[PDB]
Design a protein around this ligand. Structure first.
Ligand code: MTN
Length: 164
């Protein structure tokens, strides 16, 4: 297992524009198009991202290309962020994947708002981090995915993604 397989499990794959758990227009493997209520604005963003007249449908290779770009961007976003990089550097490879997952889902700004939990991760207090992480809108809104990520931070293994 690795970050790509992990996020593919958490986000799924859909080739036509859909609404994500928050109601925002999305396509592919969790690629947010816009927060705008307008389906046309979303179609516009899509064509702009793919570089062709898509009419809201994309192929599997287009979806995986957006996905490669988005993982790359999440990683570099962590490494340029002053709050996040020190945490990332302190973690082992499995736990780094959990941090990337969170950034991918909620963005740098969003994750940097978990200041108390991140300090606990840096200190390597895994059980205490896991409790703090669950006291969050994130956990209440997408509990099954949040449990998988939290379990990854607590154990440093892929067991939550095992047989999925
Ligand atoms: S969220 C900012 C932050 C606080 C502290 C726990 C000292 N950190 O290590 C970072 C920069 C993550």
């Amino acid at each position: 297992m690795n970050i790509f397989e992990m996020l593919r499990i958490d986000e799924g794959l859909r080739l036509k524009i859909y609404k994500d758990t928050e109601g925002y227009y999305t396509i592919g493997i969790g690629h947010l198009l816009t927060k705008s209520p307008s389906l046309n604005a979303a179609k516009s963003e899509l064509d702009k991202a793919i570089g062709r007249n898509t009419n809201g449908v994309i192929t599997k290779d287009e979806a995986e290309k957006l996905f490669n770009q988005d993982v790359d961007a999440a990683v570099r976003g962590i490494l340029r962020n002053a709050k996040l990089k020190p945490v990332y550097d302190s973690l082992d490879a499995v736990r780094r994947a959990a941090l990337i997952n969170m950034v991918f889902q909620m963005g740098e700004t969003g994750v940097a708002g978990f200041c108390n939990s991140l300090r606990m991760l840096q200190q390597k207090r895994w059980d205490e981090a896991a409790v703090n992480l669950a006291k969050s809108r994130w956990y209440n809104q997408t509990p099954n995915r949040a449990k998988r990520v939290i379990t990854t931070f607590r154990t440093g293994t892929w067991d939550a993604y095992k047989n999925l």
